[PDB]
Design a protein around this ligand. Structure first.
Ligand SMILES: Nc1ncnc2c1ncn2[C@@H]1O[C@H](COP(=O)(O)OP(=O)(O)OP(=O)(O)O)[C@@H](O)[C@H]1O
Ligand SMILES: [Mg+2]
Lengths: 49, 97, 49, 195, 98, 49
């Protein structure tokens, strides 16, 4: 009930310094940090994350 | 999509009277009202028609200051309803033997 | 229902899209009742069957 | 037709007079159809909801019918109420003809009205005063009794009628000692109260 | 208030009625006002068919301006003032003296 | 068009074509249509292909 919140987004671009631009299901785009808790080959523009 | 396709035509002789019966029942007692006779004047009418005849029969009732709906009131009301929709001409009947 | 405070499900609700009188309201008793079967009587029999 | 239901229902009870559900007015223009309704609002003092049968129908599909339904439900809520509808001329169509939009979207707001007065549940306490100019282009469903119980034609006033309309205007004004209304009304035969 | 009264009546339904309504309402608010309704040829229509869609569409716009004009809603010290070129097209409603 | 939903009808046809066999592979689909009346269709649909 207290949530493990994960917000759904889709990936908009990927930076070659190791950050990822993800657009949220809310509307905005944010810059987020690249995985180290999961695959980084499963990140591509159009990856649901 | 339905299957039971119903034509709901205009009420019969007997049909029209059933409608009058509910109305007359609300408009208290009578003493000279005959439901058939009503049918013969009102020959070719609808269910909503009969309800409005009943409404005006009531009106006609308080101009004689009555506490019930007698037969004169119905005669008048039927006549009023029907009036705008007679005359129906049949004076081609002087041109027919 | 999601508790907005942390955005997780706290409750399952019943149906549907959004019911107003979008399929609701029961009246069949006065003024039109089954004492108004003095029709047009044959037509009511077709419906009854 | 509306006064007695509101002040005098004990009289409907006693005789057994069934409730009426509208009075329809039609007539030549300017006769005083508008006045009859204006007098009724003022002199029966109960919820006078004034609408216009052309205010209905808006640019979204099926909007018009929605708008109508609101007026009729609101009257039900604010009952006792009299709805005064001016102009049934462009909201009711006796023909139904398809492959058009100017005579098929207006018919689906026409259909809603047939259908909100005696809706699912009769009655409300409407007492809808219809007003139009010609019923020749109104649907037969409006015109037939059971709603619009009394079909009041409003014609051009009579000779003695016309003498009264003159004195209605002259009462506000003033006149000389040579006005004989009888002679005036003769000339003005064939004419509406507006003329 | 100057309006070309032929640039009312849009082909989208009841939108025509909206436009004339608003102008009328403003006219009671900002009273005294003189309104000039130009061409009552094209915002007037007949009740006898000559186009199925056309006569009725125009009629909704027409009966709307008429309603505000003296139908029930206030004149607002209006004062029309209006022109047309044809008197044979005119819906009986607006035509009559009064 | 009159122009709320109407615009949308020509808008959706662009999609359906497109995917069907406009440029993209289709596999063993086998889009099966149906219509109420005979001629109410666009010429594309009528046209074998
Ligand atoms: N019967 C009447 N007696 C007195 N004056 C009247 C009468 N009828 C109309 N008038 C005068 O003419 C004015 C305009 O006519 P009114 O608005 O009453 O017409 P209407 O019958 O509703 O017309 P339309 O068919 O054009 O919608 C009134 O406000 C009043 O001054
Ligand atoms: Mg009028």
């Amino acid at each position: 009930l207290r949530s493990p919140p994960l917000l759904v987004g889709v990936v908009s671009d990927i930076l070659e310094d190791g950050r990822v631009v993800v657009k949220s299901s809310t509307g905005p785009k944010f810059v987020v940090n690249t995985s180290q808790y999961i695959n980084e080959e499963e990140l591509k523009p159009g990856a649901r994350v | 999509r339905f299957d039971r396709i119903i034509e709901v035509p205009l009420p019969t002789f007997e049909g029209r009277i059933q409608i009058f019966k509910i109305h007359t029942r609300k408009m208290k007692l009578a003493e000279d009202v005959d439901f058939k006779e009503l049918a013969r004047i009102t020959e070719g009418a609808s269910g909503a028609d009969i309800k409005a005849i009943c409404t005006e029969a009531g009106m006609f009732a308080i101009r004689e200051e009555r506490a019930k709906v007698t037969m004169l009131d119905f005669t008048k009301a039927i006549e009023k309803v029907l009036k705008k929709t007679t005359p129906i001409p049949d004076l081609k009947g002087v041109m027919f033997v | 229902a999601l508790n907005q405070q942390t955005l997780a499900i706290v409750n399952v609700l019943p149906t549907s899209k959004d019911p107003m009188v979008y399929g609701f309201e029961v009246e069949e008793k006065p003024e039109v009742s089954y004492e108004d079967i003095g029709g047009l009587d044959v037509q009511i029999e077709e419906i009854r069957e | 037709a509306v006064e007695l239901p509101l002040l005098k229902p004990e009289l409907f009870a006693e005789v057994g007079i069934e409730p009426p559900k509208g009075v329809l007015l039609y007539g030549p223009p300017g006769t005083g159809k508008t006045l009859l309704a204006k007098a009724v609002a003022n002199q029966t003092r109960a919820t006078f909801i004034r609408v216009v049968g052309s205010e209905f129908v808006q640019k979204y599909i099926g909007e018009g019918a929605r708008l109508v339904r609101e007026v009729f439900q609101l009257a039900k809520e604010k009952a006792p109420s009299i709805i005064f509808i001016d102009e049934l001329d462009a909201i009711a169509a006796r023909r139904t003809n398809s492959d058009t939009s100017g005579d098929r979207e207006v018919q689906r707001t026409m259909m809603q009205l047939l259908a909100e007065l005696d809706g699912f549940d009769p009655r409300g306490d409407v007492k809808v005063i219809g007003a139009t100019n010609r019923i020749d282009i109104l649907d037969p469903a409006i015109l037939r009794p059971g709603r619009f119980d009394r079909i009041i034609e409003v014609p051009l006033p009579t000779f003695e009628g016309r003498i009264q309309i003159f004195k209605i205007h002259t009462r506000k004004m003033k006149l000389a000692e040579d006005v004989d209304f009888k002679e005036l009304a003769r000339i003005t035969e064939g004419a509406s109260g507006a003329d």
